[PDB]
Design a protein around this ligand. Structure first.
Ligand SMILES: CC(=O)[C@H]1CC[C@H]2[C@@H]3CC[C@@H]4C[C@H](O)CC[C@]4(C)[C@H]3CC[C@]12C
Ligand SMILES: CC(=O)[C@H]1CC[C@H]2[C@@H]3CC[C@@H]4C[C@H](O)CC[C@]4(C)[C@H]3CC[C@]12C
Ligand SMILES: CC(=O)[C@H]1CC[C@H]2[C@@H]3CC[C@@H]4C[C@H](O)CC[C@]4(C)[C@H]3CC[C@]12C
Ligand SMILES: CC(=O)[C@H]1CC[C@H]2[C@@H]3CC[C@@H]4C[C@H](O)CC[C@]4(C)[C@H]3CC[C@]12C
Ligand SMILES: CC(=O)[C@H]1CC[C@H]2[C@@H]3CC[C@@H]4C[C@H](O)CC[C@]4(C)[C@H]3CC[C@]12C
Ligand SMILES: CCOC(=O)c1ncn2c1CN(C)C(=O)c1cc(F)ccc1-2
Ligand SMILES: CCOC(=O)c1ncn2c1CN(C)C(=O)c1cc(F)ccc1-2
Ligand SMILES: CCOC(=O)c1ncn2c1CN(C)C(=O)c1cc(F)ccc1-2
Ligand SMILES: CCOC(=O)c1ncn2c1CN(C)C(=O)c1cc(F)ccc1-2
Ligand SMILES: CCOC(=O)c1ncn2c1CN(C)C(=O)c1cc(F)ccc1-2
Ligand SMILES: *[C@@H]1O[C@H](CO)[C@@H](O)[C@H](O)[C@H]1NC(C)=O
Ligand SMILES: *[C@@H]1O[C@H](CO)[C@@H](O)[C@H](O)[C@H]1NC(C)=O
Ligand SMILES: *[C@@H]1O[C@H](CO)[C@@H](O)[C@H](O)[C@H]1NC(C)=O
Ligand SMILES: *[C@@H]1O[C@H](CO)[C@@H](O)[C@H](O)[C@H]1NC(C)=O
Ligand SMILES: *[C@@H]1O[C@H](CO)[C@@H](O)[C@H](O)[C@H]1NC(C)=O
Ligand SMILES: *[C@@H]1O[C@H](CO)[C@@H](O)[C@H](O)[C@H]1NC(C)=O
Lengths: 335, 335, 335, 335, 335
């Protein structure tokens, strides 16, 4: 153990962590790996998502080159703080933190040739814009961008691990989401020209397809039952004005109540959503069934034969219409 | 007191906490104990649970081997920071923190032979997936996985305490939960092969049985009374179209109102829940009682004798049906 | 000022804060005082309560014994870190923090004989289980336990201040609670045998009696008015089937609406609450008034005289029953 | 610049920040100034308020007395930490924090004679009990108490700035509140005898007048319309039992619905609020209009002429009563 | 690399970060740049907005002027802490924090001539008062003011960038908001006289125009449908007192239900909002249609010809009126 105490002391004696490795000589290339331990909750209201990853980075540093019996130096964060590390930051991040129990989860390993490995565990809430036009039969793509904050392209460059280690890995246990399904992952690299030089930023996209199960139970199913409720009126006595009247208005109150409740749980966007149309049409089918009787009753005095054909015809026309509406609605958005 | 100041200074003189004990010589074996002071709130929506534990770890470090009058060295965190400790982290953790008042709750004890005792207090929110198909007659198993972050199996190994201290202990005060019951605990050890070596991870499962009391009061009971409400209609005058009509529709509005409220308090999962079916069937029993009258009124003019048997039988079939339905529902899920 | 700088420097010169005072000689006895500046919000849902206290502790450290003109040394937190202090932790704590503005509120005072006074201000959210069977005519007792984390009975012992300084003091300004009333305070001491030795834990119980004012306004009163609403039906025309029918069902919808709203605000426990019964009985009084008419209507054809006695007697039986129900309900739980 | 480096080094050379200025000689007098940058949200439910202030303190420290070309030493927080400062804490505080971006906002300035200026920016959530008996025609007064935590009157004394600089200043931008109006400010000084000596505490009261606008829109106005709704019944056909019956019960359901929602937004106190009475009376005016008809219908069979005067009289008596009630209600509380 | 280690050591050798550059000779001028990476959520209730910016500042410090092969010194935060920096704080800030993952996002660059570049990433929640009289056809302007906390105009001055870097830049991805649209940005400088000298404060205004889409879907449309619902009553049988009565009251109950939910999502201000009027008028149109029938029914017995003209005229007057109402409402506020 005393052998390694002098090796560490020798490497760090006179080591200037303020300067990057290969300053004025080479561009420090960093091979970045990643393992998604858990895909945190996604929010279609706040347009963000949380993710728990093991973010690994390896680069070249000649100052740490040593020769000894061991081929690797297993070390903790106590050394990761004393040496230089890339100040990798996440561009689209909202807030982030590195897990600290028991000690700040930072693993450092130094090989003879100077190869460094500096990985940590991060829970980060990043941005994810969404176009909820097809919501809840929706598909969104949440990116994760990260690069160096202080080092332009001339000073530092990032690249993904190619071949040995998979670029992005995701655990099946953590990927489980109540309302989304993780389709896959995509990685890429790009250069960006900013007012403080051109930086290389590394993107990692997580494709998501929304699960409609919760919404069939909450909104679609009760709406369907409430338009069928309105269409019961056609089979009741046409001459019983109070019965047909109170039935038509109470069902509108029912649909009006149902649309009020469904509104609270839906994203607060400023455009029409695929569900917003389903609720709209259903309200029209409930409102229409009421107007249907208002016409039936208006003609009862002088044109009762006409008011009878309207009601009897409405018994088949209404369900056939709402039936075909669903045939088109689901056939359109489920594609 | 002056004796112990030189012993501590002597041990820490030249002590390199950056290196694990026995590097290149022995494997640091850590005996892990745990005491659940409180089982924090469990969340079936966020699929997580909070837990408050005293997490103890003991290993052997020859560098701390000393000779003196005392057999043990009672010390605080002021020494725990100066020595080496295993960087044990919890794999399924979402967020964790160690209690700090008055001082960081870390207890250190060093015996003559060099065995160390390093325990701390942790409140941690860990992951716990759930299959809420039988909710609220549910059973879940929440795990707690923890291992070393930087040291694979070759460098460090974990084992549960055998004999003196029980692996996992639970306090009678804290395990109390409003909606859950802690059945028991299970401990285990397993090896995992990762891209940074093979680590030993220690699992601790907490079995949970849900308490249906809250849900019988909130949803089951009012639904049952509201279908019984619908079945009152069969005993009223069939020829009074407004009475039977307004009664049939108002109860649907009532059942529709009841189902809207129950939906908010239930988990926002995307599959059918055991309660979701009970609400569904009840809505069907209310909707049927209405359709039952719609037929009675439809046949009342030309087929009054036929419409009479429908109403009278509905007086017994409906309650007998809903009665037998409950017999099957509860008998099925309570098993 | 130059006199005290050498006294302080002399005391701290060679002072080892890692070791407790009187190690291997005497047991460090700590007299703990407490002043509740404010009793934070109590939660009957999360089973928790917040409290803001000035937590004072005094012991004797021979190393700090000095001789000088001043009898005591007024000092800030800048010295509290340099000396030894008991690592007092709160056993039932959930989350705690020490006020830091302007500077960390820690007061240190050192007397000639070496007796120390070390107090701080703490806001702590501690556990408080509740048996809400009589809720909201309830009484709860919230404890506050604190002891040493690293020093067993043999090494450190706690005792309450008796006589000179009051053990626990509470300001009437902070004791104000919207839904609770602070009856009093009780203090005690006990020994607990743990796997790391036997420790002494100090308990402080705060007795609470719940205030029913908010609930009479929110729930009891509207329920009473809504069952009296149901009993208006007996005075209406028996031959008007729609009038009596819509009145009976709409009031059930009203009571069903009223009970749904009261449900969200009430604690989410899994057992029957004293109020849950009051809402239950009231719903029964509204549901019965409806069933009462269904029977009246069922007998109207062949037994109208019997259907008349039912309605007319119900005008007095119902209010006398609900009247006497309140007489019994309130008389039982208010005791 | 090298001149000031030697002056600062000279002043801080041998400076003991653990000791207060004038220890064992004089009482350190601190003139405290304050500037309310913003008056954070006020909460009548949690009985607290947030406030953002620039908290200034000035005293004399003879050790910092220097002679040089400059008359004052403009310094940042880097020096404020190195010297002694009063450990001023806010007694009624619940949680506070000092702004840190870019650097901890602490301004230090040292004059020749040794007078120091040490100001900081603080956002603090302080306590503010309220007597909401006249709510929402309300007026509250929130205090702000602060003194030294470790230094009694004998060692430190606080006094407000007088003359040139005003004790408390408030910006018109921050004083804007959605539901409150800031009447003015009051400052005062007092001594308090505590178990750790007698301290001097400085109070700053902020007088508040509540804005009734939000509640007229939410609660008062719809209630007024809903009692006028109930009084429509008197003008409808008295012999139409279903019409008058369904109208009477639906308005009660409407008023019962309205009172449930207004309740959620109101403070959860345990006494009657000025609004609680307005809602109560309105419910009584809706409930009475229903009983009015129940009487009309009860007398219609045998005493129809009397049932006519009741209905016709109620057309004038009811609105005149609700009219005079409002005349008295507003005249009482708005005074 | 060893060349730069002596240069840095040479520059920092004897460097006093407590003193500003050019003290007692020149005014430290700081050119401030800004890049809005994301425009965080805006709150019309809390009157605040969150923003994520790259806040850059550049000044000249002669002490850091060096001669070497490189023209600039790429450095991290490890040096930014060791040198002097302007203590720039944001005046209207409520809560701010600088991103810390991986390392504190502070970029430092030192040119030969002594020019420094000190930029950081900040997420800050600043104040933004609003006049929501025209809400939701609204326009608001949220400012962002920042200056030096300890250095008045005489010692430090702030200025906007000269043309190299644009003063305020906004990212195309992050500026997207659900309910607002970012029109543009305006920058300015002003002097303010405070009790601690006169400071220069830098303003940055972000103009916002509200999106009416969400409110058309949530409130306007259902209100439109519910007043049209009320106007159906004129076409139904005038002599059917129950039919017209239950329809009139239920639509009021429906509109009354609609107004409470609309109130929940709207800002809790104490003045009348453009929507508050639209909801009010719609309630008047539903209530009026009810009073319309009460008049028709009151005249039905003795003045049926008058009760016929009233009802028939109402079929056109009501929709024509509500039609023109929208024409004026939308035409006025949409301008
Ligand atoms: C002529 C007739 O059979 C009546 C019965 C119900 C009436 C409708 C009710 C809803 C609308 C009310 C509005 O005031 C005028 C247009 C609308 C659409 C009315 C047009 C005329 C209708 C259809
Ligand atoms: C002929 C008859 O007794 C009528 C009375 C109520 C009617 C039902 C009401 C609900 C549905 C409405 C839909 O438009 C057609 C199918 C459904 C299921 C109707 C079929 C015909 C029924 C059963
Ligand atoms: C025969 C008679 O006076 C009728 C009127 C209302 C009816 C009750 C309505 C509620 C229940 C409905 C259920 O379907 C059968 C039992 C229950 C309890 C009925 C039994 C028979 C009653 C009491
Ligand atoms: C005789 C008469 O005009 C009836 C019509 C409505 C009835 C009241 C309804 C509400 C109450 C119901 C209770 O069961 C008895 C007392 C109460 C207050 C009744 C007393 C008698 C009244 C006033
Ligand atoms: C005579 C007549 O056509 C009646 C029918 C509905 C009545 C109105 C109902 C609402 C109000 C009730 C109040 O008690 C008196 C004024 C108000 C405004 C009444 C005035 C008289 C009206 C308009
Ligand atoms: C794919 C790159 O992987 C990392 O960067 C990494 N960094 C730390 N660890 C890993 C591997 N990994 C996915 C773990 O879960 C894990 C499990 C352990 F028991 C100990 C360490 C790690
Ligand atoms: C316009 C003012 O900009 C800055 O002062 C600034 N400060 C840091 N950075 C920038 C440039 N900028 C707009 C970035 O996005 C960026 C991107 C990177 F990958 C690394 C650093 C920065
Ligand atoms: C069984 C696991 O034991 C620990 O890991 C442990 N660590 C600290 N403590 C314990 C023992 N234990 C269960 C306590 O509750 C306790 C009680 C005290 F008053 C002081 C210290 C502890
Ligand atoms: C019960 C032990 O109390 C303390 O140890 C204590 N610590 C701080 N303070 C006290 C006394 N006390 C009850 C106060 O309220 C108070 C009032 C002040 F103005 C200044 C300091 C304190
Ligand atoms: C009245 C008490 O005032 C202070 O003690 C104070 N402390 C800090 N500052 C002030 C003056 N003041 C009212 C400011 O707004 C201000 C404005 C600045 F740009 C920089 C510093 C300050
Ligand atoms: C992008 O950046 C990388 C950084 O190494 C560089 O090699 C490549 O030539 C650049 N290409 C473009 C188009 O910017
Ligand atoms: C797992 O690892 C431990 C390391 O101590 C070893 O003793 C055990 O045999 C291993 N078991 C398996 C199944 O790999
Ligand atoms: C606690 O145990 C100690 C011995 O360690 C004993 O002296 C003391 O009296 C005990 N206290 C109580 C309350 O039993
Ligand atoms: C409070 O105490 C101070 C001494 O520190 C004294 O000067 C002052 O007069 C006292 N106030 C009152 C009201 O007695
Ligand atoms: C313009 O501003 C930049 C800020 O970095 C500065 O370096 C440069 O010297 C300035 N030049 C002029 C002409 O203002
Ligand atoms: C701001 O103050 C400085 C102080 O010298 C002055 O030169 C400048 O003209 C002032 N600018 C404004 C807009 O007041």
């Amino acid at each position: 153990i005393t052998i390694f105490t002098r090796i560490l002391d020798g490497l760090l004696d006179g080591y200037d962590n303020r300067l990057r490795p290969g300053l004025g000589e080479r561009i420090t290339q960093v091979r970045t790996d990643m393992y998604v331990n858990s895909f945190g909750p996604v929010s279609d209201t706040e347009m963000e998502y949380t993710i728990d990853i093991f973010f690994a980075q390896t680069w070249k540093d000649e100052r740490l080159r040593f020769k000894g019996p061991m081929q690797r130096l297993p070390l903790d964060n106590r050394v990761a703080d004393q040496i230089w590390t890339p100040d990798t930051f996440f561009h689209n991040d909202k807030k982030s933190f590195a897990h600290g129990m028991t000690t700040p989860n930072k693993m450092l390993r130094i090989w003879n040739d100077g190869r460094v490995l500096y990985t940590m565990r991060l829970t980060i809430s990043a941005e994810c814009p969404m176009d909820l036009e097809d919501f809840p039969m929706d598909e969104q793509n949440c990116p994760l961008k990260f690069g160096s904050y202080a080092y332009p392209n001339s000073e530092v460059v990032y690249v993904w691990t190619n071949g040995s280690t998979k670029s992005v890995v995701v655990a099946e246990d953590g990927s489980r989401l109540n309302q989304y399904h993780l389709m896959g992952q995509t990685v890429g690299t790009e250069n960006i020209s900013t007012s403080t030089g051109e930086y290389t930023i590394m993107t990692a996209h997580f494709h998501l397809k929304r699960k409609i199960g919760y919404f069939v139970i909450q909104t679609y199913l009760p709406c369907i039952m409430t338009v069928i409720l309105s269409q019961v009126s056609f089979w009741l006595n046409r001459e019983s004005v109070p019965a047909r009247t109170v039935f038509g208005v109470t069902t509108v109150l029912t649909m009006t109540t149902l649309s009020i409740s469904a509104r609270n749980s839906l994203p607060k966007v400023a455009y029409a959503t695929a569900m917003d149309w389903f609720i709209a049409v259903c309200y029209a089918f409930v409102f229409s069934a009421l107007i249907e009787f208002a016409t039936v009753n208006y003609f009862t005095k002088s044109q009762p034969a006409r008011a009878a054909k309207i009601d009897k015809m409405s018994r088949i026309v209404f369900p056939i219409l709402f039936g075909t509406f669903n045939l088109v609605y689901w056939a359109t958005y489920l594609n």
